[PDB]
């Protein structure tokens, strides 16, 4: 499906693509917001007449968006959620149009056995709901989050790039009765400035801050109590894509020492697609930032990557706005938000 | 008399036992000190090249030079204030940069030598023989040992190799160079760099100066570098009486990673680096430096950017501390290349009682 | 309300997540409190027999009794102050000793029931059907559930088995009895007991009263009896929504041992015991008791002896703190037999949505 049908009806798709390609848009939340806006635009302006055809068109659009940018998972996720929202309503409608038993909320045997309305308003409302959800995640985490950390315990923080994780930390630090020491790993080629900023923020907040280089993780590990990840995207089996550099090794170390590994992200970051390959989804950075000169650097081929992938075996906890979950359970949460056919587009 | 007190930045809450302060710019000292020691101290304080192996050699050279320059006073004997002078030198060294195990060993050897020849012999005959003896010793326990190690390595390396390396250890550089030049095998060298000292960069430069296929990586980028790659080599500082690897910064993590991803690690060491001092953690005694090393924002050493950070004393409750010497786990390294060809790290002090 | 604050023993530097003390001796009580609650509180304060399962049943019985004794007033309606009374009772219970998830669930159910029946129906007719309903509920989620558990155990447990148990969980005792008398099998039941509580001892006694071969075990001597042991059941209290068993005393150690030595661990549980609240360590929410239980020499519970121990504030800083409930791990207990027949501990709250 090309962009021959959408030219004067919807123009913003091109702009979105541009934003994606040259990285004019920054932060997954912003991307999600943009996607939502696009969806709204599509809804308010276009014509349908039929429902299945419309659904197909939407699917095609989603596919196109995916093809334009693979590292934007939030965009995909939101679309999927919207589709799911549509689908249930459609199903409900069909039952009235025609004019059923189930053990649970969803059945497996229903796939094997042979099975005008104001749905537009409902669809519109769905988008609003999604927006609302996106707006506040930290408020639904803090009631569970500020129960784990105790007095005279030491925290270790890889990935300070995420905006949620910092907030979570701050909320914990607010409490007068609670006291903890913070060890911060830097992350050289991608996270350094961000890490520094985080450290500064911590200092401002009036907490004991310890800036640790990437090599000095091993010596302090006898004192380390907990591990927190600043992840960017959550998946099916448990595996997560983290917000750039210095996460994997630390996680491995934690696993070795049997240190508890926590993860805070959100369900809008959660994807119903499987991460079958690390090479396909993870994007690599820039060689120019590491070392100067060009003519001798033809011989010196430098390897540097943005995003990081951590196996589900190391991570045990996934606290979101709804509640505390596991990597062995999060799949069901995704299913509760994205339907069966909506996985493949 | 020297200089005392006045230390920059916060003292922190944890890890406070060893010296981390001191003379960087000289102001008022005793008018009897030979300047070569001072110069050496100045160098060591702001060094970016040395790593365990060459320092001791340099020290030995300095000592030899001193001996050559040494003149016996007309009144007092050859050893009367010499010991005092030595003590002063030691104190200066400690003030500048804490003494290593090799350095301690050297000092011990010197002391032994001093005891051996009693004050009775003339000036020009004694030191003639002393300097030659010391040279001979140097030839024996260091260079020859290194050569032996190299040769051992040569036979140990098979066909088709892909190696990940770390450090400014001279022996490793020699090894890699040898591989490149005289062996003519299918060698691939991958380099890991560290923040406190640009050792990896130096290694890379050296490789380039020979003409080797080089991949360049860091401590963070390790999850993608494996995805074919087999051997892992590290540079050791000293092995204790316990058997644990008491070495430089980013080694232990690398070793752990190697262990996780199937293939074990091999480490090289000399037959003099062994110590009788007992410790099992980095907290006991550690090389701690001024937080001036962790100021520059990436790229290169001399850049100086007015970005986000540039304050330590004015900041309320902020601890910016880094460690240089680490204690790696015992079971993780399998191969140790010493004076006795090949052996396990669990031997610990088999050469210490042998002397 | 009664008595508040003013208690012996220090707040302690280590472990202070929950409040440590409460009424034990009755003085100045409100003239509206039902005596059965008071008696229960008196019992719980110094109990040896009950643990999680029977307690809830007892509570339910008490509630039923209260309902039977309750009649609708002329002025105030049936749903006017009952809820307040319930709240007060809950507060009293909490003051006495921290409560379980089952009790909370029961309370919730009661609240729901209160909402369900509208204040318009005849009063005599209302409570008649209420008490019947409650009885039915009790039969279903306890007795029937127990039966189900027993049946599950039956199909899984082989001919002639050795079972190692801890605590005083009633369900396990019932199971053992069933194994003994009704089915007739060769059983070797090893029961482990700790210092402050004689639950294991009680279990052993009960077994003896039926006619079973029992081995009495202790925390100090564990490894001697394992090295032979095929099947291990733990005293369950509550399963969290992560996959961790919040259970009584040194069960975690036992689980660890089991993991180390061949065989996996088994856990029998009720369908209503499950909690949506989440925690991953023993430090999170600790259940505490007075250090007065560990003062005397053991043998029996009431002794009153003069010896050496008997100082908490008299001597130079003496802290004698202990924990009643600990955390058992995730991967080690795999087996779970519930009201929904089959499932694992990795399946944390799949039954919670199904109800």
Coordinates of N, CA and C in Angstrom, one line a residue, chain B residues 136-333:
Chain B
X136 N 73.5 -7.4 36.2 CA 73.4 -8.8 35.9 C 72.1 -9.4 36.4
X137 N 71.8 -8.9 37.6 CA 70.5 -9.3 38.3 C 69.3 -8.9 37.4
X138 N 69.4 -7.7 37.0 CA 68.3 -7.1 36.1 C 68.1 -8.0 34.8
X139 N 69.3 -8.3 34.2 CA 69.3 -9.1 33.0 C 68.7 -10.5 33.3
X140 N 69.0 -11.1 34.4 CA 68.5 -12.4 34.9 C 67.0 -12.5 35.2
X141 N 66.6 -11.8 36.2 CA 65.2 -12.0 36.7 C 64.1 -11.2 36.0
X142 N 64.5 -10.3 35.1 CA 63.5 -9.5 34.4 C 63.4 -9.8 32.9
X143 N 64.4 -9.4 32.1 CA 64.3 -9.4 30.7 C 64.3 -10.8 30.2
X144 N 65.2 -11.7 30.7 CA 65.2 -13.1 30.4 C 63.9 -13.8 30.7
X145 N 63.4 -13.5 31.8 CA 62.1 -14.1 32.3 C 61.0 -13.7 31.3
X146 N 61.0 -12.4 30.9 CA 60.0 -11.9 29.9 C 60.1 -12.7 28.6
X147 N 61.4 -12.8 28.2 CA 61.7 -13.6 26.9 C 61.1 -15.0 27.0
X148 N 61.4 -15.6 28.1 CA 60.9 -17.0 28.4 C 59.4 -17.1 28.3
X149 N 58.7 -16.1 28.9 CA 57.3 -16.0 28.9 C 56.7 -15.9 27.5
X150 N 57.4 -15.0 26.7 CA 57.1 -14.8 25.3 C 57.1 -16.1 24.5
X151 N 58.2 -16.8 24.7 CA 58.5 -18.0 24.0 C 57.4 -19.1 24.4
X152 N 57.1 -19.2 25.7 CA 56.0 -20.0 26.1 C 54.7 -19.7 25.5
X153 N 54.4 -18.5 25.4 CA 53.2 -18.0 24.7 C 53.1 -18.4 23.2
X154 N 54.3 -18.3 22.6 CA 54.4 -18.6 21.2 C 54.0 -20.0 20.8
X155 N 54.4 -21.0 21.6 CA 54.0 -22.4 21.5 C 52.5 -22.7 21.8
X156 N 52.0 -21.9 22.8 CA 50.6 -22.0 23.3 C 49.6 -21.5 22.3
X157 N 49.9 -20.6 21.5 CA 49.0 -20.0 20.5 C 48.8 -21.0 19.3
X158 N 47.6 -21.3 18.9 CA 47.2 -22.3 17.9 C 47.0 -21.6 16.5
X159 N 46.1 -22.1 15.7 CA 45.7 -21.5 14.4 C 44.3 -20.9 14.5
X160 N 44.2 -19.8 13.7 CA 43.0 -18.9 13.7 C 42.6 -18.4 15.1
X161 N 43.0 -17.1 15.3 CA 42.8 -16.5 16.6 C 42.0 -15.2 16.6
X162 N 41.2 -14.9 17.5 CA 40.4 -13.7 17.7 C 40.5 -13.3 19.2
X163 N 41.3 -12.3 19.6 CA 41.6 -12.0 20.9 C 41.1 -10.6 21.4
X164 N 40.6 -10.5 22.6 CA 40.2 -9.3 23.3 C 41.2 -9.0 24.4
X165 N 41.8 -7.8 24.3 CA 42.9 -7.4 25.2 C 42.7 -6.1 26.0
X166 N 43.4 -5.9 27.1 CA 43.3 -4.7 28.0 C 44.6 -4.4 28.7
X167 N 44.9 -3.1 28.9 CA 46.0 -2.6 29.7 C 47.2 -2.0 29.0
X168 N 48.0 -1.4 29.8 CA 49.3 -0.9 29.3 C 50.5 -1.7 29.7
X169 N 50.2 -3.0 30.0 CA 51.2 -4.0 30.4 C 52.1 -4.2 29.2
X170 N 53.4 -4.0 29.4 CA 54.5 -4.0 28.4 C 54.6 -5.4 27.8
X171 N 54.5 -6.4 28.6 CA 54.7 -7.8 28.2 C 53.6 -8.2 27.2
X172 N 52.4 -7.8 27.4 CA 51.3 -8.0 26.5 C 51.6 -7.4 25.1
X173 N 52.0 -6.1 25.2 CA 52.4 -5.4 24.0 C 53.5 -6.1 23.2
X174 N 54.5 -6.6 23.9 CA 55.6 -7.3 23.3 C 55.1 -8.6 22.6
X175 N 54.2 -9.3 23.3 CA 53.6 -10.5 22.8 C 52.8 -10.3 21.5
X176 N 51.9 -9.3 21.6 CA 51.1 -9.0 20.4 C 52.0 -8.6 19.2
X177 N 53.0 -7.8 19.5 CA 53.9 -7.3 18.5 C 54.6 -8.5 17.8
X178 N 55.1 -9.4 18.7 CA 55.7 -10.7 18.3 C 54.8 -11.5 17.3
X179 N 53.6 -11.6 17.7 CA 52.6 -12.3 17.0 C 52.5 -11.7 15.6
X180 N 52.3 -10.4 15.6 CA 52.2 -9.6 14.3 C 53.4 -9.8 13.4
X181 N 54.6 -9.7 13.9 CA 55.8 -9.7 13.1 C 56.3 -11.1 12.8
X182 N 56.8 -11.8 13.8 CA 57.7 -13.0 13.6 C 56.9 -14.3 13.4
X183 N 55.7 -14.4 13.9 CA 54.8 -15.6 13.8 C 54.0 -15.7 12.5
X184 N 53.6 -14.5 12.0 CA 52.8 -14.4 10.8 C 51.5 -15.2 10.7
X185 N 50.8 -15.3 11.8 CA 49.5 -16.0 11.9 C 48.3 -15.2 11.5
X186 N 47.1 -15.7 11.7 CA 45.9 -15.0 11.5 C 45.3 -14.3 12.8
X187 N 46.1 -13.3 13.3 CA 45.8 -12.7 14.6 C 44.9 -11.5 14.4
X188 N 43.8 -11.4 15.2 CA 42.9 -10.3 15.3 C 43.0 -9.7 16.8
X189 N 43.2 -8.4 16.9 CA 43.3 -7.8 18.2 C 42.2 -6.8 18.5
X190 N 41.4 -7.0 19.6 CA 40.4 -6.1 20.0 C 40.8 -5.5 21.3
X191 N 40.7 -4.1 21.4 CA 41.2 -3.4 22.5 C 40.1 -2.8 23.4
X192 N 40.2 -2.9 24.7 CA 39.3 -2.3 25.7 C 40.0 -1.1 26.4
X193 N 39.4 0.0 26.5 CA 39.9 1.2 27.1 C 39.3 1.6 28.4
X194 N 40.0 2.3 29.3 CA 39.6 2.7 30.6 C 39.7 4.2 30.9
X195 N 38.8 4.7 31.7 CA 38.8 6.2 32.0 C 39.9 6.8 32.8
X196 N 40.4 6.1 33.9 CA 41.5 6.8 34.7 C 42.8 7.0 33.9
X197 N 43.2 6.0 33.1 CA 44.4 6.1 32.3 C 44.1 5.5 30.9
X198 N 44.6 6.3 29.9 CA 44.4 5.9 28.5 C 45.5 4.9 28.0
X199 N 45.3 3.6 28.5 CA 46.2 2.5 28.2 C 45.8 1.8 26.9
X200 N 44.5 1.6 26.8 CA 43.9 0.9 25.6 C 44.3 1.7 24.4
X201 N 44.1 3.0 24.4 CA 44.4 3.9 23.3 C 45.9 3.8 22.9
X202 N 46.8 3.7 23.9 CA 48.2 3.6 23.7 C 48.5 2.3 23.0
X203 N 47.8 1.2 23.5 CA 48.0 -0.1 22.9 C 47.6 -0.1 21.4
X204 N 46.5 0.5 21.2 CA 46.0 0.7 19.8 C 47.0 1.4 18.9
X205 N 47.5 2.5 19.4 CA 48.5 3.3 18.7 C 49.8 2.4 18.4
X206 N 50.2 1.6 19.4 CA 51.3 0.7 19.2 C 51.1 -0.3 18.1
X207 N 49.8 -0.9 18.1 CA 49.4 -1.8 17.1 C 49.5 -1.2 15.7
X208 N 49.0 0.0 15.6 CA 48.9 0.8 14.4 C 50.4 1.0 13.8
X209 N 51.3 1.3 14.8 CA 52.7 1.5 14.4 C 53.3 0.2 13.9
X210 N 52.7 -0.9 14.1 CA 53.1 -2.2 13.5 C 52.4 -2.6 12.2
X211 N 51.1 -2.3 12.2 CA 50.2 -2.6 11.1 C 49.3 -3.9 11.3
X212 N 48.5 -3.8 12.3 CA 47.6 -4.9 12.7 C 46.1 -4.5 12.5
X213 N 45.3 -5.5 12.2 CA 43.8 -5.3 12.1 C 43.2 -5.2 13.5
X214 N 42.8 -4.0 13.8 CA 42.3 -3.6 15.2 C 40.9 -3.1 15.2
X215 N 40.1 -3.8 16.1 CA 38.9 -3.4 16.6 C 39.1 -2.6 18.0
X216 N 38.3 -1.6 18.2 CA 38.5 -0.7 19.4 C 37.1 -0.6 20.1
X217 N 37.1 -1.0 21.4 CA 35.9 -1.0 22.2 C 36.2 -0.5 23.6
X218 N 35.1 -0.5 24.4 CA 35.2 0.0 25.8 C 34.6 -1.0 26.8
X219 N 34.5 -0.6 28.1 CA 34.0 -1.4 29.2 C 32.5 -1.7 29.0
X220 N 31.8 -0.7 28.5 CA 30.3 -0.7 28.3 C 29.9 -1.6 27.1
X221 N 30.6 -1.4 26.0 CA 30.3 -2.2 24.8 C 30.9 -3.5 24.8
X222 N 30.2 -4.5 25.3 CA 30.7 -5.9 25.4 C 29.6 -7.0 25.0
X223 N 28.3 -6.6 25.1 CA 27.2 -7.5 24.8 C 27.1 -7.8 23.3
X224 N 27.6 -6.9 22.5 CA 27.5 -7.0 21.0 C 28.8 -7.4 20.3
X225 N 29.9 -7.2 21.0 CA 31.2 -7.5 20.4 C 31.5 -9.0 20.2
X226 N 30.9 -9.8 21.0 CA 31.0 -11.3 20.8 C 30.3 -11.8 19.6
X227 N 29.1 -11.3 19.3 CA 28.3 -11.7 18.2 C 28.6 -10.9 17.0
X228 N 33.3 -17.4 17.3 CA 34.1 -16.5 16.4 C 35.3 -15.9 17.2
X229 N 34.9 -15.3 18.3 CA 35.9 -14.7 19.2 C 36.2 -15.6 20.4
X230 N 37.5 -15.9 20.6 CA 37.9 -16.9 21.6 C 38.7 -16.4 22.8
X231 N 40.0 -16.1 22.6 CA 41.0 -15.9 23.6 C 40.8 -14.5 24.3
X232 N 41.0 -14.5 25.6 CA 41.0 -13.2 26.4 C 42.3 -13.2 27.2
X233 N 43.0 -12.1 27.1 CA 44.3 -11.8 27.8 C 44.3 -10.6 28.7
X234 N 44.8 -10.7 29.9 CA 44.9 -9.6 30.9 C 46.3 -9.4 31.4
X235 N 46.6 -8.2 32.0 CA 47.8 -7.8 32.6 C 47.8 -7.7 34.1
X236 N 48.6 -8.5 34.8 CA 48.6 -8.6 36.2 C 49.6 -7.7 36.9
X237 N 49.3 -7.2 38.1 CA 50.3 -6.4 38.8 C 51.1 -7.2 39.8
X238 N 50.3 -8.0 40.6 CA 50.9 -8.9 41.7 C 49.9 -9.9 42.1
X239 N 50.5 -11.1 42.5 CA 49.7 -12.2 43.1 C 50.0 -12.4 44.5
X240 N 49.0 -12.4 45.4 CA 49.1 -12.4 46.8 C 49.3 -13.8 47.4
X241 N 49.4 -14.0 48.7 CA 49.6 -15.3 49.4 C 48.3 -16.1 49.3
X242 N 47.2 -15.5 49.0 CA 45.9 -16.1 48.9 C 45.7 -16.8 47.5
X243 N 46.2 -16.1 46.5 CA 46.1 -16.6 45.1 C 45.2 -15.7 44.2
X244 N 44.6 -14.7 44.8 CA 43.7 -13.8 44.1 C 44.5 -12.8 43.3
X245 N 43.9 -12.4 42.2 CA 44.5 -11.5 41.2 C 44.4 -10.0 41.7
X246 N 45.5 -9.5 42.2 CA 45.5 -8.1 42.7 C 46.2 -7.2 41.5
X247 N 45.3 -6.7 40.7 CA 45.7 -6.0 39.4 C 45.0 -4.7 39.3
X248 N 45.1 -4.1 38.1 CA 44.6 -2.8 37.8 C 43.0 -2.7 37.7
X249 N 42.5 -1.7 37.1 CA 41.1 -1.4 37.1 C 40.1 -2.4 36.4
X250 N 39.9 -2.2 35.1 CA 38.9 -3.0 34.3 C 39.4 -4.3 33.8
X251 N 39.5 -5.3 34.7 CA 39.9 -6.7 34.3 C 38.9 -7.7 34.8
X252 N 38.5 -7.5 36.0 CA 37.7 -8.5 36.7 C 36.3 -8.7 36.0
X253 N 35.7 -7.6 35.6 CA 34.4 -7.6 34.9 C 34.6 -8.4 33.6
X254 N 35.7 -8.1 32.9 CA 36.0 -8.7 31.6 C 36.1 -10.2 31.8
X255 N 36.8 -10.6 32.8 CA 37.0 -12.0 33.1 C 35.7 -12.7 33.4
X256 N 34.8 -12.0 34.2 CA 33.5 -12.5 34.5 C 32.7 -12.8 33.2
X257 N 32.8 -11.8 32.3 CA 32.1 -11.8 31.0 C 32.5 -13.0 30.2
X258 N 33.9 -13.2 30.2 CA 34.5 -14.3 29.5 C 34.0 -15.7 30.0
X259 N 34.0 -15.7 31.3 CA 33.5 -16.9 32.0 C 32.0 -17.3 31.6
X260 N 31.2 -16.2 31.6 CA 29.8 -16.3 31.2 C 29.7 -16.8 29.8
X261 N 30.4 -16.2 28.9 CA 30.4 -16.6 27.5 C 31.5 -17.7 27.1
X262 N 31.3 -18.8 27.8 CA 32.1 -20.1 27.5 C 33.6 -20.1 27.8
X263 N 34.3 -19.3 27.0 CA 35.8 -19.4 26.9 C 36.5 -18.7 28.1
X264 N 37.4 -19.4 28.8 CA 38.2 -18.9 29.9 C 39.3 -17.8 29.6
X265 N 39.9 -17.3 30.6 CA 40.9 -16.2 30.5 C 42.3 -16.6 30.8
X266 N 43.3 -16.0 30.2 CA 44.7 -16.2 30.5 C 45.4 -14.9 30.9
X267 N 46.2 -15.0 32.0 CA 46.9 -13.9 32.6 C 48.4 -14.2 32.7
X268 N 49.2 -13.1 32.5 CA 50.7 -13.3 32.6 C 51.3 -12.5 33.8
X269 N 52.3 -13.1 34.4 CA 53.0 -12.6 35.6 C 54.4 -13.0 35.7
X270 N 55.2 -12.2 36.4 CA 56.7 -12.4 36.6 C 56.9 -13.2 37.9
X271 N 58.1 -13.8 38.0 CA 58.6 -14.6 39.1 C 59.3 -13.8 40.2
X272 N 58.7 -12.6 40.5 CA 59.3 -11.7 41.5 C 58.1 -10.9 42.1
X273 N 57.0 -10.8 41.4 CA 55.8 -10.0 41.8 C 55.0 -10.5 43.0
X274 N 55.3 -11.8 43.4 CA 54.6 -12.4 44.5 C 54.9 -11.8 45.9
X275 N 53.8 -11.7 46.7 CA 53.8 -11.0 48.0 C 53.4 -11.9 49.2
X276 N 53.9 -11.5 50.3 CA 53.6 -12.2 51.6 C 52.4 -11.5 52.3
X277 N 52.0 -10.3 51.9 CA 50.9 -9.6 52.4 C 49.6 -10.2 52.1
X278 N 48.7 -10.3 53.1 CA 47.4 -11.0 53.0 C 46.2 -10.1 52.9
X279 N 45.5 -10.1 51.8 CA 44.3 -9.3 51.6 C 43.4 -10.0 50.6
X280 N 42.1 -9.8 50.8 CA 41.0 -10.5 49.9 C 40.0 -9.5 49.4
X281 N 40.2 -8.2 49.5 CA 39.3 -7.1 49.0 C 40.1 -5.9 48.6
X282 N 39.4 -5.0 47.8 CA 40.0 -3.7 47.4 C 40.0 -2.7 48.5
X283 N 39.3 -2.9 49.6 CA 39.1 -2.0 50.7 C 40.4 -1.9 51.6
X284 N 41.1 -3.0 51.6 CA 42.4 -3.1 52.5 C 43.4 -2.1 52.2
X285 N 43.9 -2.1 51.0 CA 44.9 -1.1 50.5 C 44.8 -0.9 49.0
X286 N 44.5 0.4 48.6 CA 44.1 0.7 47.3 C 44.8 2.0 46.8
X287 N 45.2 2.0 45.5 CA 45.7 3.2 44.8 C 44.6 4.1 44.5
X288 N 44.5 5.2 45.3 CA 43.5 6.2 45.1 C 44.1 7.5 44.7
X289 N 43.6 8.1 43.7 CA 44.1 9.4 43.1 C 43.1 10.5 43.2
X290 N 43.6 11.7 42.9 CA 42.7 13.0 42.9 C 41.6 12.9 41.8
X291 N 40.4 13.4 42.1 CA 39.3 13.4 41.1 C 39.5 14.2 39.9
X292 N 40.7 14.7 39.6 CA 41.0 15.5 38.5 C 41.1 14.7 37.2
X293 N 41.3 13.4 37.3 CA 41.2 12.4 36.2 C 39.9 12.3 35.5
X294 N 38.8 12.4 36.4 CA 37.4 12.3 35.9 C 36.7 13.6 35.8
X295 N 37.4 14.5 35.0 CA 36.9 15.9 34.7 C 36.6 16.1 33.2
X296 N 37.5 15.6 32.4 CA 37.5 15.7 30.9 C 36.3 15.0 30.3
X297 N 35.5 15.7 29.5 CA 34.3 15.1 28.8 C 34.7 14.4 27.5
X298 N 35.0 13.1 27.6 CA 35.3 12.2 26.5 C 36.3 12.7 25.5
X299 N 36.3 12.1 24.3 CA 37.1 12.5 23.1 C 38.6 12.3 23.4
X300 N 39.2 13.3 24.0 CA 40.7 13.3 24.2 C 41.0 13.8 25.6
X301 N 42.3 13.7 26.1 CA 42.7 14.2 27.3 C 42.8 15.7 27.4
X302 N 43.5 16.4 26.4 CA 43.5 17.9 26.5 C 42.4 18.5 25.5
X303 N 41.3 18.8 26.1 CA 40.2 19.5 25.4 C 39.6 20.7 26.2
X304 N 39.4 20.5 27.5 CA 38.8 21.5 28.4 C 37.5 22.2 27.9
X305 N 36.4 21.6 28.2 CA 35.1 22.2 27.9 C 34.3 22.7 29.1
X306 N 33.6 23.8 28.9 CA 32.8 24.4 30.0 C 31.3 23.9 29.7
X307 N 31.1 22.6 30.0 CA 29.8 22.0 29.8 C 28.8 22.1 30.9
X308 N 28.8 21.0 31.7 CA 27.9 20.9 32.9 C 28.5 20.8 34.2
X309 N 29.6 20.1 34.3 CA 30.3 19.9 35.6 C 31.7 20.5 35.6
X310 N 32.1 21.0 36.8 CA 33.4 21.6 37.0 C 33.6 22.2 38.4
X311 N 33.0 21.5 39.4 CA 33.0 21.9 40.8 C 33.0 20.7 41.7
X312 N 33.8 20.7 42.8 CA 33.9 19.7 43.8 C 33.7 20.1 45.3
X313 N 34.4 21.2 45.6 CA 34.4 21.8 47.0 C 33.1 22.6 47.3
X314 N 32.7 23.3 46.3 CA 31.5 24.2 46.5 C 30.1 23.4 46.6
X315 N 30.1 22.2 46.0 CA 29.0 21.3 46.0 C 28.7 20.7 47.3
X316 N 27.5 20.8 47.8 CA 27.1 20.3 49.1 C 26.6 18.8 49.0
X317 N 27.3 18.0 49.8 CA 27.1 16.5 49.8 C 27.2 15.9 48.3
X318 N 28.4 15.7 47.9 CA 28.7 15.1 46.6 C 30.1 14.4 46.7
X319 N 30.1 13.1 46.4 CA 31.3 12.3 46.5 C 31.6 11.7 45.2
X320 N 32.7 12.2 44.6 CA 33.2 11.7 43.3 C 34.5 11.0 43.5
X321 N 34.5 9.7 43.6 CA 35.6 8.9 43.9 C 35.8 7.7 42.9
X322 N 37.0 7.4 42.6 CA 37.4 6.3 41.7 C 38.6 5.5 42.2
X323 N 38.6 4.2 41.8 CA 39.6 3.3 42.2 C 40.5 2.9 41.1
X324 N 41.8 2.6 41.3 CA 42.7 2.2 40.3 C 43.1 0.7 40.3
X325 N 43.4 0.2 41.5 CA 43.8 -1.2 41.7 C 42.7 -2.0 42.3
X326 N 42.4 -3.2 41.7 CA 41.3 -4.0 42.0 C 41.8 -5.4 42.4
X327 N 40.9 -6.2 43.1 CA 41.1 -7.6 43.4 C 40.1 -8.5 42.7
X328 N 40.6 -9.2 41.7 CA 39.8 -10.1 40.9 C 39.6 -11.5 41.6
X329 N 38.6 -12.2 41.3 CA 38.3 -13.5 41.8 C 39.3 -14.6 41.4
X330 N 39.4 -15.6 42.3 CA 40.5 -16.6 42.2 C 40.2 -17.6 41.1
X331 N 39.0 -18.2 41.0 CA 38.6 -19.3 40.1 C 38.5 -18.9 38.6
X332 N 38.2 -17.6 38.3 CA 38.0 -17.2 37.0 C 39.2 -17.2 36.0
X333 N 40.4 -16.8 36.4 CA 41.5 -17.0 35.5 C 42.0 -18.5 35.7

